[PDB]
RNA sequence: UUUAAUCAAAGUUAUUAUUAAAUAAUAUUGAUUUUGGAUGAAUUUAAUUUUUAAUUAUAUUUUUGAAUUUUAAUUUUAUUAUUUUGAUUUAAUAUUUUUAAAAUAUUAUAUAUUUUAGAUUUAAAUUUGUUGUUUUAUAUUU
RNA sequence: AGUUUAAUGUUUAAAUAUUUAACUAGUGAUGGCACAGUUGUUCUAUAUGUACCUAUAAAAAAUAGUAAAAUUAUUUUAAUUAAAUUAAUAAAUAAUUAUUAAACUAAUUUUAUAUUAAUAUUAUGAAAAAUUUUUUUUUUUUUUAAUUUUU
RNA sequence: UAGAUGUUUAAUGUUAAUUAAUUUAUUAUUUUAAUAUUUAAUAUUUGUUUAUACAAAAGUAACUUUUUUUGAAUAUAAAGAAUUAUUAUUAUAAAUAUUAUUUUAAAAAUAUAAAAAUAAAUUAUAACAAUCUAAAUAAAUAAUAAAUUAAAAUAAAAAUUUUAAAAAAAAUUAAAAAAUUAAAAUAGGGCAAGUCCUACUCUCCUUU
RNA sequence: AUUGAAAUAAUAAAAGG
């Protein structure tokens, strides 16, 4: 098969009428009141390419998949189940304190996927994580020279990090401004 | 040929609004720092085998490079050359089948 | 090993506390009233103020 | 052979028609002197 | 051979974490389950489910001082002809009808007499003369037997009983088509 | 999404979404008998199957789903349909000149004719609801659509397009009759009615422009 | 089976092509109470015949001299045999101007041999195997793989399988021990008995169906392809690639028979459609095979007859993939000549002894008759 | 499309092979040939062979004619293949297709009169060594017979004149 | 804010190709750049044996201990082979693949079909005094 | 600080490593050159000849003729299940199961009964004494169903 | 329900004579070569501090513009155990350069290593001390039919017992031990034949 | 009749305890 040669124009549809290779219009069996009437298959797809693309863009989210995060996925998942449900104000805050690389991976992605949403017209405050998944990614392979002439192949696994920041207005947050008491003996010196 | 084909992100299902590939060159400082300082990777500057040997390409690599530059075949031109600047020619098939316009360059 | 582990058995590892007390825990934090960044109580900045008084 | 590989890239031997056997091998000389088959067919 | 792996691959949806995932290990399971349903259905399901019923009609007989040990022998003595699943339907939905039975088998009522054999009528022997006009003596009685049994069944208003109102005239419905 | 568009969407899965015979059939297999005779089509052995299939569109059982039912979406959506399936080059030669375009462009005029009869038949039930809270800025393009599709503007759709088009017409003149004696829409933030003069004048202008057309 | 219990037909009609059932008073397209895979009426595959084939009239042709156009006789006198039709077969020959010049008897031996399927099968079964590229059916063997000769590992101490010199069909580089090379295959033999007899029962079926038509001449007035395609429009030979096409046995005119074609027609006979052109004979050469015992072990090509039937003869695959048969009257004479000495030796003695009386055995060599055309 | 498992019958492909041991022997062409019978010695080892050549050793020169029935001849002269006017020889028989050419090997033929008692028309035949009663039959009918016994090249120089 | 804890993964991914294999009787001093280099022996592969030469039968016969059949028409065409039709026809056809989707039964332990119970040798081969031998299989696709 | 041995190591820093254990005092020797597999060296160990002396390399067939192991196709339409055995001048059949075919009569209910031929198939293994429990391996779904009493 | 007394596949299936809904009956348990698990929350990695000589063969992943000679031509860095690994590859010349890689805040077994007693350096010592965490990063290995289990008692089969049966009541998790489970019908005596062995008088085809 | 022998100390394969 070759779309450049086995299908010259996808808007057409070649037939054989009276042993003549004729190429009529391509249609689709779209729906009606209870009948099925054929409409232009290039027009039927200009809607979906737009009515869907114009459906999503007016959905208060920011879908953002970062491919090839350099870490195994089985270890990356366990440290994304913590962030599931956390608000972005308290996910960038709890990724910046944990030690694991998987959190440094998310934070850098949760920043690029945070400023990108600003140019998309979403507030920085009421942003709240909605979906954050982990798919296995492409792998590398080091040779692992071992003893007695044996060897193996250390595979350096990577992963993908698909993330979507929903927006909820009524997202009220727990107080994190509260200075401890022992630190409020800042009265001394001031 | 059976079901409609729309933007590859809408009916496929994984709809992202901004895909980021980290294996690019621009994002090098973003990945080369994410990994630990304890993850040492040797051969940063020199390779092990001799790389100034001449080697072929991957199978899939030629397949891409043969379709881009097909005229490298012997006598790719059209055996008589009948198309010249200023000719009065109309298209026949493909995109916009049937428009008329004079050649300006060949 | 003596056999392979079915999935309901690799999840069995995640029931006990030694797994949840190593991965699935969130730290209490707060903004240093001066250093302006999140912090845990006890560990302090390097700034001569964030270090003389101990927010 | 899959499509093309070092086992088919190169060229081992090639094989041609097999010669037959003697047409009447199975009437071995050792019987043509011991016995004589008699009677009508069947 | 033929593992029936086409059919038994749709079933792999309703299995647990391993048989649902891997096609091989799912077949050895779903073909082990399906081979034991059909093994339990044709072999052991009867003798078990057939005793949860002889326990329900029995337990419903103890509430009347009798039991299956006695009820079983006297549902047959009276020719009642009730499947042992039917007696459980009555004991649970029509509790009175069951009780009504349990009173019958305990009653001293004569069970119906065994069905009779074939009796030769007297008229079979009664020597027939050389008379061609009149019918045989045995048919004039056997036919009467058939038309009485024909009218006793149902309450068919035979055209609001437009057919011969009495029997000796119904046997003469052959003269109705003579001129 | 199985069944495609329950109410809103145009897309569906009919006679071109096949039946895949080689896979572990996901759900609704209440009984194991459902391998040789799944007997879907039965309504109860179908709601079990149809629900757990390709997500009954919900974005994720709490994720944000789209607001398609409102006149603020359907009608500026229908703007882009005819503004694409009929580019202005067809609109100019139709609106200005009465001369025949060509057979080709007459097909592109009829190719989109029965493309309005689709997005209407799908999203008509939605149009009537948000008609209540529909706004005049959006109640004013409902006649301005069927022009670029070249249709004279004035159950089956015809019964319901009439009553709706009659329903909107009054609500437009009401508002236009509500404008001549217009109360104070904002005594604050814009107590001076600027941009409201020309924009609502051109409305009254462009409203009666289509009337002779329609 | 009976899986896929739903999702086949969308529950709605199409726009303007679906019709519900009115009732049993009207008739649908295609309906017929007989199982027909190629359903044809007298408009799509119109038989070129006087009558229409029927169970009443044994064949769609004249069985008696119609007196409004001259009557020609066959060249050789006709004797009826086992499979013959036992009735006259008078077939109106045509002219290149799409006319009916004269009517002519047809020899019952060739054109009236009632067909049988258990023999036209042997014609088709022979073709479907003879018409077959053998040299393409070439696969490698175990001993053409070019691998090491030694066992690729000591069979015992290694945690592997007991295998040596892995070049076998289990592996993605090996090949079948007994693979399919060309010379292993079969070119079946086919004698003159079962070739003629099969073929003569195919030009009869082509009559009983009514797709037979004798033509005076098949010459084009000029060697172009226009004169060919124009000759088919006037004479009515649907020869488009999809519609059923003609089969052209060619033998020149009645007075000028010629076993080879006409350079005018031959050159115009080439057109990418459902047209064929075959040699004007049904008999074929006697089958021989020299390499019968793999003696010449350098040979390529199937076992069996080394004298195969050439593709341009009349077979049973193009006897049916081309519906109309178009014989020329020159071709007729050659059929009656070459089959003559064949039908005579296929008679009982008591009947073969009456032929010298009925003018069957007038020997052009003993001068007892002027030489035949 | 089945496997003739011996002592078990036709079996499906993909079926059970547990009981096809001796079948995997027959396919490999490996022949035991009932050789476990060491105890009972066959007629093979105990059969004195006469005739260092053999019982019917067809050494070169052995005059073994191919039998031609006489009734096959008298059936081809009234069928009409043979013209009884002429001296019927081996050339006609081959050309009249009375007898095939695979029958004729040196020395040519032999005329045998079995289940034939009379020959009505006179007949003159050239064959190699007809039998006694075959001769007497032809001689009794007015016709005659001769014994044209000849070397090989005599047969060829005659059958292909 | 409460979640008692648990419980699920079904059925789709771009953008680029014309290569292999057999077949064809019309070439040929070794495939991978400029010898010696003193003007000379470097650069030598020759010899009557089934050999890059490749054989139309079933008889007879050597010890029947396995062996096996003769010009076909004599310079006539079974010949060692490719080309200004992607050479021709047949047969075969692939990654870089990089792609990826959802809260029903339990909650004091016996295994799927949701009335809650009941029901359980993993297969194949192997073992014909061991059916129950003591081998094999992680799974997926080819 | 060069010489015949013992623990650790146990895919080990090594496809033999570190320490333990048994004697000889370079005016005669680290390779120059040299040897080669139906055989070299040979201080004669059937030790060693490039990380398995079955040396390595190449090409090949007799090589499980060997309790070898595999041998791709559901829904079917005929049966049996341990039986056989004589080395060797003129005595009716080996037996099994299998494939393919064949014929009803002195010979009873108006019962019942798988006999014959052709071909395919011969290895499933007892030693003493005594002597002249039972029918199950295999089920189309709904019902139906006769073998239970303690010391 | 349903042909029948049960082991040699059903097909014009988008007519390999078709062109818009084929929704194609299709998959070999194991010997194949690719991927994916499980061992794996893992083993091993972890770089804050030492004492400097020259040749050759050895490589050439390799660059060079910058001073080779007063010779014309030529050439001036780099390894080998698979490695950037247990390592002064040392034929030679040598003697005061701080001349530039080693994480960790716990506990046991082990492993190295260590004050006191039944004239020498020794003991044994399985005794203090001393070194060897964890978490973070990185990640391999052999192994894998699966279980619905698996505590514990207790009888049942040419049998050796994997199961099954009665009777019980057996909870997660991490860690550490190895009691049980996953690595040969064998060791020792007493006999008899056989191969190995020697020896020739008589045996066979040796060739030299 | 047609090679004849040797605890041939060790191996192998058997039985027997």
Short mmCIF file of N, CA, C and O (backbone and C1' of nucleotides) in Angstrom, two decimals, chain J residues 79-111:
data_model
loop_
_atom_site.label_atom_id
_atom_site.label_comp_id
_atom_site.label_asym_id
_atom_site.label_seq_id
_atom_site.Cartn_x
_atom_site.Cartn_y
_atom_site.Cartn_z
P A J 79 -17.39 -49.04 15.08
"O5'" A J 79 -17.46 -49.98 16.35
"C5'" A J 79 -18.69 -50.17 17.02
"C4'" A J 79 -18.89 -51.62 17.37
"C3'" A J 79 -17.65 -52.37 17.81
"O3'" A J 79 -17.32 -52.13 19.16
"C1'" A J 79 -18.82 -53.66 16.23
P U J 80 -15.79 -52.06 19.61
"O5'" U J 80 -15.45 -53.57 19.97
"C5'" U J 80 -16.40 -54.35 20.67
"C4'" U J 80 -16.03 -55.81 20.67
"C3'" U J 80 -14.68 -56.13 21.30
"O3'" U J 80 -14.75 -57.36 22.00
"C1'" U J 80 -14.71 -56.88 19.07
P U J 81 -14.96 -57.36 23.59
"O5'" U J 81 -13.73 -58.18 24.14
"C5'" U J 81 -12.57 -57.51 24.62
"C4'" U J 81 -11.68 -57.11 23.48
"C3'" U J 81 -10.18 -57.12 23.77
"O3'" U J 81 -9.48 -57.54 22.60
"C1'" U J 81 -10.81 -54.99 23.02
P A J 82 -8.93 -59.04 22.47
"O5'" A J 82 -9.11 -59.66 23.93
"C5'" A J 82 -8.07 -59.59 24.90
"C4'" A J 82 -7.12 -60.75 24.77
"C3'" A J 82 -6.77 -61.46 26.07
"O3'" A J 82 -6.55 -62.84 25.82
"C1'" A J 82 -4.81 -60.62 25.08
P A J 83 -7.75 -63.89 25.95
"O5'" A J 83 -7.70 -64.66 24.57
"C5'" A J 83 -6.45 -64.96 23.96
"C4'" A J 83 -6.41 -64.47 22.54
"C3'" A J 83 -5.39 -65.14 21.65
"O3'" A J 83 -5.87 -66.37 21.16
"C1'" A J 83 -5.41 -62.79 21.28
P A J 84 -5.17 -67.75 21.55
"O5'" A J 84 -4.87 -68.41 20.14
"C5'" A J 84 -3.54 -68.62 19.72
"C4'" A J 84 -3.11 -67.65 18.66
"C3'" A J 84 -1.75 -67.93 18.05
"O3'" A J 84 -1.83 -68.91 17.04
"C1'" A J 84 -1.94 -65.63 18.56
P U J 85 -1.66 -70.45 17.40
"O5'" U J 85 -0.63 -70.96 16.32
"C5'" U J 85 0.57 -71.59 16.73
"C4'" U J 85 1.77 -70.75 16.44
"C3'" U J 85 3.10 -71.42 16.76
"O3'" U J 85 4.08 -71.00 15.83
"C1'" U J 85 2.90 -69.44 18.02
P U J 86 4.60 -72.03 14.72
"O5'" U J 86 4.62 -73.42 15.50
"C5'" U J 86 5.60 -73.68 16.50
"C4'" U J 86 6.10 -75.09 16.41
"C3'" U J 86 7.00 -75.34 15.22
"O3'" U J 86 7.91 -76.38 15.55
"C1'" U J 86 5.03 -76.61 14.98
P A J 87 9.44 -76.04 15.75
"O5'" A J 87 9.89 -75.54 14.31
"C5'" A J 87 10.71 -74.37 14.15
"C4'" A J 87 10.89 -74.06 12.68
"C3'" A J 87 10.67 -75.23 11.73
"O3'" A J 87 9.48 -75.19 10.96
"C1'" A J 87 12.72 -74.05 11.25
P A J 88 8.95 -76.52 10.27
"O5'" A J 88 9.79 -76.61 8.93
"C5'" A J 88 10.20 -77.89 8.43
"C4'" A J 88 11.42 -77.78 7.55
"C3'" A J 88 11.93 -79.13 7.05
"O3'" A J 88 11.60 -79.34 5.69
"C1'" A J 88 13.70 -77.85 8.08
P U J 89 10.14 -79.86 5.33
"O5'" U J 89 10.39 -81.08 4.34
"C5'" U J 89 9.47 -82.18 4.34
"C4'" U J 89 9.24 -82.68 2.94
"C3'" U J 89 8.04 -83.60 2.79
"O3'" U J 89 7.05 -82.94 2.01
"C1'" U J 89 10.02 -84.51 1.74
P A J 90 6.17 -81.76 2.64
"O5'" A J 90 4.98 -81.62 1.60
"C5'" A J 90 5.00 -82.38 0.38
"C4'" A J 90 3.63 -82.93 0.10
"C3'" A J 90 2.86 -83.41 1.33
"O3'" A J 90 1.81 -82.45 1.37
"C1'" A J 90 2.78 -85.02 -0.47
P A J 91 1.06 -82.14 2.73
"O5'" A J 91 -0.47 -82.35 2.34
"C5'" A J 91 -1.49 -81.65 3.04
"C4'" A J 91 -1.81 -82.38 4.32
"C3'" A J 91 -2.76 -81.65 5.27
"O3'" A J 91 -3.97 -82.40 5.21
"C1'" A J 91 -0.79 -82.46 6.42
P A J 92 -5.37 -81.73 5.56
"O5'" A J 92 -5.23 -80.24 5.05
"C5'" A J 92 -5.06 -79.16 5.95
"C4'" A J 92 -5.33 -77.86 5.25
"C3'" A J 92 -5.23 -76.61 6.09
"O3'" A J 92 -3.89 -76.17 6.21
"C1'" A J 92 -7.20 -76.55 4.79
P U J 93 -3.28 -75.74 7.63
"O5'" U J 93 -3.26 -74.16 7.55
"C5'" U J 93 -4.48 -73.45 7.67
"C4'" U J 93 -4.41 -72.08 7.06
"C3'" U J 93 -4.28 -70.96 8.07
"O3'" U J 93 -3.69 -69.83 7.45
"C1'" U J 93 -6.37 -70.81 7.01
P A J 94 -2.11 -69.58 7.56
"O5'" A J 94 -1.90 -69.15 9.07
"C5'" A J 94 -2.81 -68.29 9.72
"C4'" A J 94 -2.69 -68.40 11.21
"C3'" A J 94 -3.52 -67.43 12.02
"O3'" A J 94 -4.84 -67.90 12.22
"C1'" A J 94 -1.29 -67.39 12.79
P A J 95 -6.11 -66.93 11.98
"O5'" A J 95 -6.16 -66.05 13.29
"C5'" A J 95 -5.98 -66.64 14.56
"C4'" A J 95 -5.47 -65.63 15.55
"C3'" A J 95 -6.16 -64.29 15.50
"O3'" A J 95 -7.40 -64.29 16.18
"C1'" A J 95 -3.85 -63.94 15.51
P U J 96 -8.35 -63.02 16.03
"O5'" U J 96 -7.70 -61.99 17.06
"C5'" U J 96 -8.24 -60.70 17.23
"C4'" U J 96 -7.15 -59.68 17.41
"C3'" U J 96 -7.44 -58.34 16.78
"O3'" U J 96 -8.37 -57.56 17.50
"C1'" U J 96 -5.28 -58.99 16.19
P U J 97 -9.92 -57.65 17.11
"O5'" U J 97 -10.25 -56.20 16.57
"C5'" U J 97 -9.94 -55.06 17.34
"C4'" U J 97 -8.91 -54.21 16.65
"C3'" U J 97 -9.34 -53.54 15.37
"O3'" U J 97 -10.15 -52.40 15.57
"C1'" U J 97 -7.27 -54.54 15.02
P A J 98 -11.30 -52.07 14.50
"O5'" A J 98 -10.50 -51.60 13.21
"C5'" A J 98 -9.68 -50.46 13.25
"C4'" A J 98 -8.85 -50.32 12.00
"C3'" A J 98 -9.59 -50.24 10.69
"O3'" A J 98 -10.19 -48.98 10.47
"C1'" A J 98 -7.78 -51.69 10.45
P U J 99 -11.64 -48.90 9.81
"O5'" U J 99 -11.35 -48.81 8.26
"C5'" U J 99 -10.51 -47.79 7.75
"C4'" U J 99 -9.98 -48.15 6.39
"C3'" U J 99 -11.01 -48.53 5.35
"O3'" U J 99 -11.66 -47.42 4.77
"C1'" U J 99 -9.29 -50.12 5.33
P U J 100 -13.20 -47.54 4.35
"O5'" U J 100 -13.18 -48.62 3.19
"C5'" U J 100 -12.54 -48.33 1.97
"C4'" U J 100 -12.50 -49.52 1.06
"C3'" U J 100 -13.83 -50.17 0.76
"O3'" U J 100 -14.61 -49.45 -0.18
"C1'" U J 100 -12.28 -51.84 1.27
P A J 101 -16.17 -49.80 -0.31
"O5'" A J 101 -16.17 -51.06 -1.26
"C5'" A J 101 -17.28 -51.93 -1.28
"C4'" A J 101 -16.85 -53.33 -1.58
"C3'" A J 101 -17.90 -54.39 -1.35
"O3'" A J 101 -18.84 -54.46 -2.40
"C1'" A J 101 -15.87 -55.08 -0.41
P A J 102 -20.34 -54.92 -2.07
"O5'" A J 102 -20.18 -56.46 -1.75
"C5'" A J 102 -19.65 -57.34 -2.72
"C4'" A J 102 -19.71 -58.76 -2.25
"C3'" A J 102 -21.04 -59.24 -1.72
"O3'" A J 102 -21.95 -59.57 -2.74
"C1'" A J 102 -19.34 -59.89 -0.24
P A J 103 -23.52 -59.52 -2.44
"O5'" A J 103 -23.82 -60.94 -1.79
"C5'" A J 103 -23.87 -62.11 -2.59
"C4'" A J 103 -24.01 -63.33 -1.74
"C3'" A J 103 -25.30 -63.44 -0.94
"O3'" A J 103 -26.37 -64.00 -1.68
"C1'" A J 103 -23.48 -63.75 0.51
P C J 104 -27.89 -63.69 -1.26
"O5'" C J 104 -28.08 -64.42 0.15
"C5'" C J 104 -29.34 -64.48 0.82
"C4'" C J 104 -29.58 -65.84 1.45
"C3'" C J 104 -30.76 -65.94 2.41
"O3'" C J 104 -31.29 -67.26 2.34
"C1'" C J 104 -28.81 -66.56 3.54
P U J 105 -32.80 -67.60 2.80
"O5'" U J 105 -33.00 -69.12 2.35
"C5'" U J 105 -33.28 -70.14 3.30
"C4'" U J 105 -32.65 -71.45 2.89
"C3'" U J 105 -32.28 -72.39 4.02
"O3'" U J 105 -33.36 -73.19 4.47
"C1'" U J 105 -30.45 -72.18 2.51
P A J 106 -33.43 -73.65 6.01
"O5'" A J 106 -33.47 -75.24 5.94
"C5'" A J 106 -32.43 -75.98 5.31
"C4'" A J 106 -32.75 -77.46 5.24
"C3'" A J 106 -32.92 -78.17 6.58
"O3'" A J 106 -34.25 -78.07 7.07
"C1'" A J 106 -31.48 -79.42 5.16
P A J 107 -34.56 -77.44 8.51
"O5'" A J 107 -33.28 -77.82 9.38
"C5'" A J 107 -33.30 -77.66 10.79
"C4'" A J 107 -32.37 -76.56 11.24
"C3'" A J 107 -32.65 -75.17 10.69
"O3'" A J 107 -33.69 -74.50 11.37
"C1'" A J 107 -30.33 -75.63 10.57
P U J 108 -34.34 -73.18 10.75
"O5'" U J 108 -35.89 -73.33 11.07
"C5'" U J 108 -36.33 -74.11 12.17
"C4'" U J 108 -37.44 -73.43 12.93
"C3'" U J 108 -37.02 -72.20 13.73
"O3'" U J 108 -38.02 -71.18 13.65
"C1'" U J 108 -37.96 -73.83 15.19
P U J 109 -37.56 -69.67 13.38
"O5'" U J 109 -37.53 -69.01 14.82
"C5'" U J 109 -38.70 -68.43 15.38
"C4'" U J 109 -39.22 -69.24 16.54
"C3'" U J 109 -40.72 -69.39 16.63
"O3'" U J 109 -41.21 -70.41 15.78
"C1'" U J 109 -39.85 -68.81 18.75
P U J 110 -42.03 -70.04 14.45
"O5'" U J 110 -41.27 -68.76 13.88
"C5'" U J 110 -41.75 -68.08 12.74
"C4'" U J 110 -41.79 -66.59 12.95
"C3'" U J 110 -41.56 -66.14 14.39
"O3'" U J 110 -40.90 -64.88 14.40
"C1'" U J 110 -43.72 -65.46 13.68
P U J 111 -39.30 -64.79 14.36
"O5'" U J 111 -38.86 -65.03 15.87
"C5'" U J 111 -39.23 -64.10 16.87
"C4'" U J 111 -38.25 -64.08 18.02
"C3'" U J 111 -36.88 -63.48 17.74
"O3'" U J 111 -36.89 -62.07 17.70
"C1'" U J 111 -36.67 -65.43 19.08
#
